[PDB]
């Protein structure tokens, strides 16, 4: 199981 | 390579 | 498949 | 064409003097490129342009006033301030007495005193620093 | 897929072969269109000389490496992977996010003595920036600074960053050239030089430091120890130390890939001229026309105690694009009420 | 049979380098012929500061 | 008062150029000073004079001077700005000289302006030139960033820091002014720089 | 067709084999009449040495290379491909663009101390000039400049371009010219000199950048350590340095017609003489009687941070060319009464 | 206050121009300064006298000057200006004197002028010619580029500044002039150089 | 599959 | 069909 | 033209060579619709 | 086929 990229974020 | 053509290879002790 | 090998500018060398 | 260089460059001169060969010729025929120069169009025979010339150099125009300077001889003491030149109102306190705010005060202020005629090249000097002049201080 | 890793061994087989891997799999990925913001994550669960690897939750499921050869003192890595490139994602509706290259400086000069590579700063960022700028997805690049950026003026990243018209700044300190010397009496000397680099992301809207890390890999200097090397020439970067900072590179590429690629870009608005705005971004970076945008009202301050703060004032104005140029965007607001409120500094997001 | 390599006059490693050549100013930007890199400074010794 | 009278604005300062020049025409009230003549010999090999070494050039209507300028904020390259002129070596008097051509250069030793013209002295070893200095370079301004400008009291103190505060608060509204300490207060101001100064010029009238 | 590729080996065969086939497609293409803003794209896929090569979407399909020699110590390759010339195309219906050549410079003067070699950067700015000039399908060369163009300045670089009549304002930097030496003991010594160069191609209409492209090969250096080379002189050109200089300039011209090339041409408004306007493009640049030009009223502002921004005002105005010289031509305004509103630096498109 | 009396426009800059010159008929006033005798052997030389090396001219009626001179913007070949000739040597008096031909330089290091005539002195070491230097080289303006002008205050205020941008806006009409800062105003004005001359002209006249 | 050259843009 | 091969101007030599 | 310049050079002492100096100042503030020729 | 040398043209 591999760590997920960082999800949508804003400011 | 490794050597400089301008400045050379600047590359019985015993 | 088959992935090309082309290679591309270098970045400074 | 011809040009013509004003001996004092200014804009407003060299708008006027495009405007007086209009207004003798006719329209589209000099135009001001620059503070200083104007072009009119001239025929190209030299005999024509010469005639032609003779007629455009005697044209009268009023050439503007220009910027307001105050023109100040350092070594021989002559100080001539020129039109549209406009001194602030303030208190100038030259030796031992005071004064309120073109020269012609100025020069009782320093009469006042003995000092000398010389002594208001200084105070412009001091009223260009706090800045009641409405002009520029030129020193030749 | 088809592809072949190569890599120089350093000092163990282990970290040669994983680094071949590494190359193929981020070529296999780049030709197959898969981010390469995800590889980053990938390369851990990697440490492993398995010979099948199992994934799940990424574009890759099973890896298997067909063919090892250590040809020319050089491992080559030949593997055949299985990408499914996805249509969504957080990284694929977002415009190109511009970055500013920072100085990079070398702490201890005493390091750079052998070789006398003093301008090794300077000639990696430019390196990050030429890989910043060709070589990455969701990034461009506006060139590089020689000013110093720091955390404790947030102020100055901000008008630095306006200055350039960068999103983000990207400066680092490089904190270990040192070298060791291996001794064989069949052969020659060894000398192992390391390469320590820290680099820092700061946000040039408020001035926040919003990536750090920290890079260290060693390789052979093959130059004699009197010899002077010129970190601009190819004699520098064709060798294996020179290898090892394009490698380093790529990796300072692949982490801001991961972890910069799915913040949502945020154009600024340059000029208001009544009822149309002016857009930073342009064709270059993404946009197309009949976007709609969301208007954002930016009040960033610095608090009590003099550090960056953040706060925007949600908005009622959305704006479509009108006309596009390569750099700019015009917009108009479909608010023309509104439209007096709109100040030079405002942001804006594109409604998915 | 001699063990030593004698130099050769004219070696790249000891020939001078000729300085670059400075751009041209432009003065048709600015109205003016100053120029940060070309100016001349009267009272100056003259002392060498720069490559060549 | 007004708020311009007492107070000036964050970020608006001025620069101190100097420099080193020599003054011509002097009715023999000139130097001799070793530093005099290398100067004047140096000029002299810059037109294609160049005496031999050891010359002396008993030069009696030189004088080698330090010119200081203030370059006033937002000075734009062609503007005219005052020098003062004052003798280093052991010249008598500078009345009725000419300065040559001085750079003048700013505290990270690059040159802003140069300064000629003629010198008006009234002390006969201090002189001025009222725009003998042309602006050559320009220096970069904070003026136009932030969401804010800033008030330094000439005179510090509380109450007239409060005072200004209360001031612009009436004029515009309230939570517009705030006094920081007791030398500064930060008024929030336009993005736009045309209308920062448009908003400036209104609040640096207020009594 | 029936093309030959002569590329002299450096260091490697596959290199000089894949030189000499871009030398063969480069002339069957020109022969042919197809396009060569196309061919850039197509050398990425032509790193396999494969004997059969498949295309789509392009104007030549299948490749078969029949006869590869290696005579006099250069490759030579024999190839038949069949080209499709397309009539249409994005390039085909637009005027052409005049482009000044600026100044290109050596970072390092060291570099250039063998051979002494230092006016490099003006004797190549020369031969790109005649590259556009005269080897280019839709660039004409208004001379080279002695003025460097920045990124900082884009005031300058439009002034620039307004004296020279030009569009766009190329110029670049030398940033290696540094040598190795490969010895061994049955024969001479081996001098591999490096040429690397970075492109810059600016708009002159705004400032803008709209270019950037880095170039790096290595050629051997046939002159003594202590023999000065004259870069003006046939010694120098054509000695295998020379030749790499010679393909990096030919691939520089290829770079911009791939980039350049399909951007819509627009000719400026020079002068207005009641209703008829002067257009600073003519004869030589493609221009014919009785085309149709859309107006658009140009405004480029320098945005409140100093950089360079874009905004073209749409016009109802149409013109009609009336009269055509070599050089300029004149266009009747087919609205009368918006006759008023034409100045000086508006733009013109070709209505298609 | 007109705006051309209390502001100038950017671009349209004055240029400082200097020379080295020798004055001559001098009534036993001049020097015998090493430079002095060391210009006037060579520009003996330049006319076919060439004295033998070491002998001295004895020269009295000429002395060694510095000529400087302003060069007003718009200066075309053939105008004539001003030249303040100061001396720099241990000459009494420049009085009764002439300034031979003297090449005028600029900070590029081009010549730009001759300078000749009758000097003019009152201070008798510095002395003035009304028409000295004949301007035989053009310097470049950047006054007809861009699509705005731009006028600097020469007493620099956020007050001036909006002061003067509100009598353009009200002259000519909305969305015209803007101040940038307390020293410039941009005022948009025509691509054609006849036409911002014209342009120009009315608006330098405001009040 | 040959990437295509640039398609026609303005400005 | 054969493309021809004629030579042209150098562009520098 | 002259007359009132050479009565303001007559108040003072001065000198009548002294009005030489008082037009090139005129000629500096551009009060001169003419060419001031030295000879 | 040879190339055609310029056809008239004026100015």
Chains 1, 10, 13 share one sequence.
């Not at chain 5, 574009?59 to 490139?85: A, F, Q, T």
């Not at chain 7, 000073?33 to 030189?62: D, H, R, W, Y």
């Not at chain 7, 330094?152 to 009436?170: I, Y």
Request: charged share 20%; glycine share 8%; net charge negative.
């Amino acid at each position: 199981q591999v760590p997920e990229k960082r999800q949508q974020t804003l400011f | 390579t490794v050597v400089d053509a301008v400045e050379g290879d600047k590359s019985v002790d015993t | 498949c088959a992935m090309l090998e082309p290679i591309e500018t270098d970045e400074v060398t | 064409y011809i040009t013509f260089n004003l001996l004092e460059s200014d804009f407003t001169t060299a708008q006027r003097m495009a405007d007086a060969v209009n207004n003798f010729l006719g329209p589209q025929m000099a135009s001001a490129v620059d503070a200083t120069s104007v072009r009119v169009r001239a025929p190209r025979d030299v005999s024509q342009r010469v005639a032609f010339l003779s007629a455009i150099e005697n044209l009268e125009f009023d050439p503007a006033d220009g910027a307001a300077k105050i023109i100040v001889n350092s070594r021989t003491g002559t100080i001539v301030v020129g039109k549209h030149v406009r001194l602030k109102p303030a208190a100038v306190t030259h030796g031992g007495m005071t004064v309120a705010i073109t020269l012609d005060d100025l020069v009782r202020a320093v009469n006042q005193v003995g000092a000398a005629p010389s002594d208001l090249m200084a105070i412009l000097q001091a009223l260009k620093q706090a800045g009641a002049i409405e002009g520029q201080l030129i020193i030749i | 897929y088809e592809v072949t890793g190569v890599a120089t061994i350093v000092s163990s087989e282990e970290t040669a072969r994983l680094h071949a891997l590494e190359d193929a799999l981020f070529k296999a990925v780049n030709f197959s269109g898969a981010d390469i913001g995800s590889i980053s994550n990938l390369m851990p669960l990697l440490e492993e000389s398995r010979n099948e690897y199992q994934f799940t939750n990424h574009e890759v499921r099973y890896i298997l490496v067909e063919s090892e050869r250590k040809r020319r003192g050089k491992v080559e890595v030949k593997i055949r992977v299985d990408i499914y490139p996805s249509a969504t994602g957080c990284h694929t509706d977002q415009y190109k996010k511009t970055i500013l290259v920072g100085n990079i400086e070398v702490a201890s000069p005493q390091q750079a003595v052998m070789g006398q590579i003093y301008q090794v700063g300077d000639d990696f960022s430019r390196v990050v920036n030429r890989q910043l700028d060709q070589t990455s997805r969701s990034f461009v690049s506006v060139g590089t600074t020689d000013y110093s950026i720091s955390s404790n003026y947030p102020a100055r990243t901000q008008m630095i960053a306006q200055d350039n018209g960068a999103q983000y700044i990207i400066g680092g300190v490089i904190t270990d050239l040192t070298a060791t010397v291996e001794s064989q009496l069949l052969q020659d000397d060894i000398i192992n030089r390391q390469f320590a680099l820290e680099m820092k992301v700061f946000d040039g809207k408020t001035g926040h430091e919003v990536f750090n890390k920290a890079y260290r890999e060693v390789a052979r200097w093959p130059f004699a120890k009197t010899s002077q090397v010129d970190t601009r020439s190819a004699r520098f970067w064709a060798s294996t130390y020179g290898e090892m900072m394009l490698r380093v590179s790529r990796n300072i590429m692949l982490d801001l890939e991961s972890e910069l690629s799915c913040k949502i870009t945020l154009p600024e608005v340059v000029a208001v001229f009544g009822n149309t705005v002016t857009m930073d971004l342009g064709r270059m970076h993404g946009v197309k026309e009949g976007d709609k945008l969301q208007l954002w009202h930016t009040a960033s301050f610095i608090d009590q105690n003099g550090l960056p703060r953040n706060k925007v004032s949600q908005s009622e104005i959305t704006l479509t694009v009108s006309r596009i140029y390569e750099h700019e965007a015009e917009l108009t607001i479909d608010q023309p009420n509104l439209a007096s409120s709109v100040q030079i500094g405002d942001v804006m997001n594109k409604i998915l | 049979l001699r063990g030593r390599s004698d130099p050769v006059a004219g070696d790249p490693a000891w020939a001078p380098i000729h300085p670059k050549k400075k751009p041209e100013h432009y003065a048709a930007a600015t109205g003016s012929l100053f120029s940060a890199e070309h100016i001349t400074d009267l009272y100056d010794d003259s002392k060498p500061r720069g490559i060549g | 008062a007004r708020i311009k009278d007492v107070a000036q604005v964050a970020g608006v300062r001025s620069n101190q150029l100097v420099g080193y020049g020599l003054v011509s025409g002097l009715p023999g009230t000139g130097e001799a000073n070793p530093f005099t003549e290398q100067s004047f010999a140096a000029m002299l090999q810059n037109f294609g004079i160049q005496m031999p070494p050891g010359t002396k050039p008993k030069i009696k209507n030189v004088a080698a001077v330090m010119v200081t300028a203030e370059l006033p904020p937002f000075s734009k390259p062609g503007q005219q700005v005052d020098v003062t002129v004052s003798s280093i070596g052991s010249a008598k008097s500078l009345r009725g000289g000419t300065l040559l051509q001085t750079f003048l250069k700013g505290l990270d030793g690059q040159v802003y302006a140069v300064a000629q013209g003629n010198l008006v002295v009234s002390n006969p070893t201090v002189g001025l030139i009222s725009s003998g200095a042309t602006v050559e370079r320009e220096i970069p301004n904070p003026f136009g960033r932030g969401d804010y400008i800033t008030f330094n009291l000439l005179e510090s103190d509380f109450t007239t820091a409060q005072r200004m505060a209360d001031a612009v608060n009436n004029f515009l509204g309230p939570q517009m002014a705030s006094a920081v300490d007791a030398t500064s207060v930060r008024v929030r101001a336009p993005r736009d720089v045309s209308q920062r100064v448009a908003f400036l010029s209104a609040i640096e009238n207020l009594e």
